[PDB]
Design an enzyme around this catalytic site. Structure first.
Site, PDB file in Angstrom:
ATOM      1  N   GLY A  21     -56.948  49.840  31.982  1.00  0.00           N
ATOM      2  CA  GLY A  21     -56.528  50.870  32.922  1.00  0.00           C
ATOM      3  C   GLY A  21     -55.497  50.410  33.939  1.00  0.00           C
ATOM      4  O   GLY A  21     -55.267  49.212  34.107  1.00  0.00           O
ATOM      5  N   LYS A  22     -54.881  51.369  34.625  1.00  0.00           N
ATOM      6  CA  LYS A  22     -53.802  51.080  35.568  1.00  0.00           C
ATOM      7  C   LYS A  22     -53.711  52.166  36.642  1.00  0.00           C
ATOM      8  O   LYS A  22     -54.121  53.306  36.416  1.00  0.00           O
ATOM      9  CB  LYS A  22     -52.469  50.948  34.817  1.00  0.00           C
ATOM     10  CG  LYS A  22     -51.274  50.520  35.664  1.00  0.00           C
ATOM     11  CD  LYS A  22     -50.192  49.863  34.806  1.00  0.00           C
ATOM     12  CE  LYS A  22     -49.007  50.789  34.579  1.00  0.00           C
ATOM     13  NZ  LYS A  22     -48.593  50.830  33.144  1.00  0.00           N
ATOM     14  N   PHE A  25     -52.932  51.027  42.693  1.00  0.00           N
ATOM     15  CA  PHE A  25     -53.555  49.814  43.216  1.00  0.00           C
ATOM     16  C   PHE A  25     -53.067  48.545  42.520  1.00  0.00           C
ATOM     17  O   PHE A  25     -52.609  47.598  43.162  1.00  0.00           O
ATOM     18  CB  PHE A  25     -55.083  49.921  43.085  1.00  0.00           C
ATOM     19  CG  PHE A  25     -55.537  50.594  41.814  1.00  0.00           C
ATOM     20  CD1 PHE A  25     -55.785  49.853  40.667  1.00  0.00           C
ATOM     21  CD2 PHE A  25     -55.713  51.969  41.765  1.00  0.00           C
ATOM     22  CE1 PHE A  25     -56.193  50.467  39.498  1.00  0.00           C
ATOM     23  CE2 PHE A  25     -56.125  52.591  40.597  1.00  0.00           C
ATOM     24  CZ  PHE A  25     -56.365  51.836  39.461  1.00  0.00           C
ATOM     25  N   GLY A  26     -53.167  48.541  41.198  1.00  0.00           N
ATOM     26  CA  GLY A  26     -52.931  47.358  40.398  1.00  0.00           C
ATOM     27  C   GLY A  26     -53.379  47.629  38.977  1.00  0.00           C
ATOM     28  O   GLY A  26     -52.905  48.573  38.343  1.00  0.00           O
ATOM     29  N   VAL A  28     -56.768  47.310  35.807  1.00  0.00           N
ATOM     30  CA  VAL A  28     -58.192  47.205  35.493  1.00  0.00           C
ATOM     31  C   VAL A  28     -58.407  46.501  34.152  1.00  0.00           C
ATOM     32  O   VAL A  28     -57.709  46.775  33.175  1.00  0.00           O
ATOM     33  CB  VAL A  28     -58.861  48.589  35.453  1.00  0.00           C
ATOM     34  CG1 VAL A  28     -60.362  48.454  35.176  1.00  0.00           C
ATOM     35  CG2 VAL A  28     -58.610  49.339  36.752  1.00  0.00           C
ATOM     36  N   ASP A 134     -61.656  62.579  45.713  1.00  0.00           N
ATOM     37  CA  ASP A 134     -60.818  62.666  44.530  1.00  0.00           C
ATOM     38  C   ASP A 134     -61.666  63.040  43.330  1.00  0.00           C
ATOM     39  O   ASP A 134     -61.553  62.413  42.278  1.00  0.00           O
ATOM     40  CB  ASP A 134     -60.073  61.345  44.281  1.00  0.00           C
ATOM     41  CG  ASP A 134     -58.863  61.513  43.362  1.00  0.00           C
ATOM     42  OD1 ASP A 134     -58.441  62.666  43.091  1.00  0.00           O
ATOM     43  OD2 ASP A 134     -58.320  60.480  42.929  1.00  0.00           O
ATOM     44  N   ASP A 152     -63.846  55.519  41.066  1.00  0.00           N
ATOM     45  CA  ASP A 152     -62.590  55.469  41.814  1.00  0.00           C
ATOM     46  C   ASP A 152     -62.758  55.972  43.231  1.00  0.00           C
ATOM     47  O   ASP A 152     -62.473  57.127  43.550  1.00  0.00           O
ATOM     48  CB  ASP A 152     -61.472  56.239  41.122  1.00  0.00           C
ATOM     49  CG  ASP A 152     -60.111  55.995  41.772  1.00  0.00           C
ATOM     50  OD1 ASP A 152     -60.056  55.333  42.843  1.00  0.00           O
ATOM     51  OD2 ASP A 152     -59.090  56.464  41.218  1.00  0.00           O
TER      52      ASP A 152
END
Ligand SMILES: [Cl-]
Length: 288
Positions: A21-22, A25-26, A28, A134, A152
């Site tokens: 994942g992306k 933030f950065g 995963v 969210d 998240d």
């Protein structure tokens, strides 16, 4: 600062595997807890390539560290490694509710089952004076055997005795409550609006206004009448959506109240039945 329990040298306790994942933030990654051989999800953030949202990344760790619920992704700890901060969380391999929508539509039993578990998560968070902010199908993750958890917490807020409402413009526009877009004083009732939009998303496959540029919905949502669920759906499902999507936040029910809604009681079944949906996605994904 709120990092009192920050740990050191993560690679002694965990093995980093492949990326999954992306985000803003950065990145995963899948990983292994070498103590248990359980699989984990490792969110990695480059502290130097990070800026401003450094203030967010801390907030996220803070909220995660304070949650202890089977309906919220378990938090393993945050670890420092050179310039990188590892945020280690429960891994869930079933796919997000949004993923499970990709192959085709859900039926109302599946919708009710998923909503009921989201509601248990929201009830837990709101009883802890936390607001997710969210809520959307993409942030509802499932285990491969059908457990449903919220994920998240990157823009999650906290209420306190001195701060009884929030004001910050955060969330994902299609799912944002009108009072959040207006940046008026809001609380956990914002999550209930987002839940109503998520119900439409689960039923229709997409939220209202989804073909429009998100900037347009920033005036459309506060202005327009609230969305309703249109189409051949049961009356209780339509009323569930209606109850959530009230412009006036104080007229929205609580998560606790929604757990007793006719739609939920009549249609929700065991979460293990969701493995059917999880299997459908795996088959679908393998042939893409
Ligand atoms: Cl899993």
């Amino acid at each position: 600062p709120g990092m009192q329990n920050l740990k050191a040298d993560p690679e002694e306790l965990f093995t980093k595997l492949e990326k999954i994942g992306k985000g803003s933030f950065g990145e995963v990654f899948k990983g292994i807890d070498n103590r248990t051989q359980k699989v984990v999800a490792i969110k990695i953030i480059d502290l130097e390539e990070a800026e401003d949202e450094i203030e967010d990344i801390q907030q996220e760790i803070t909220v995660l560290s304070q949650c202890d619920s089977p309906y919220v992704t378990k938090y393993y700890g945050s670890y420092l490694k050179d310039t990188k901060l590892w945020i280690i969380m429960e891994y869930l391999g079933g796919g997000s509710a949004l993923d499970l929508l990709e192959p085709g539509p859900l039926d109302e039993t599946q919708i009710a089952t998923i909503l009921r578990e989201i509601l248990k998560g929201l009830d837990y968070l709101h009883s802890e004076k936390k607001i997710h902010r969210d809520i959307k199908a993409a942030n509802v993750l499932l285990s491969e055997h059908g457990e449903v958890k919220l994920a998240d917490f990157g823009v999650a807020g906290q209420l306190t005795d001195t701060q009884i409402k929030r004001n910050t413009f955060v969330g994902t526009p299609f799912w944002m409550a009108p009072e959040v877009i207006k940046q008026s004083a809001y609380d956990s009732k914002a999550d209930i609006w987002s839940l109503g939009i998520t119900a439409i998303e689960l039923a229709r496959g997409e939220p209202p206004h989804s073909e429009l540029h998100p900037m347009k919905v920033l005036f459309l949502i506060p202005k327009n009448n609230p969305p309703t669920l249109e189409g051949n759906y049961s009356k209780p499902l339509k009323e569930f959506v209606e109850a959530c999507l009230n412009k006036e936040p104080s007229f929205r029910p609580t998560a606790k109240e929604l757990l007793k809604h006719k739609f939920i009681l009549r249609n929700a079944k065991k979460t293990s039945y969701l493995t059917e949906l999880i299997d459908r996605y795996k088959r679908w994904k393998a042939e893409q």
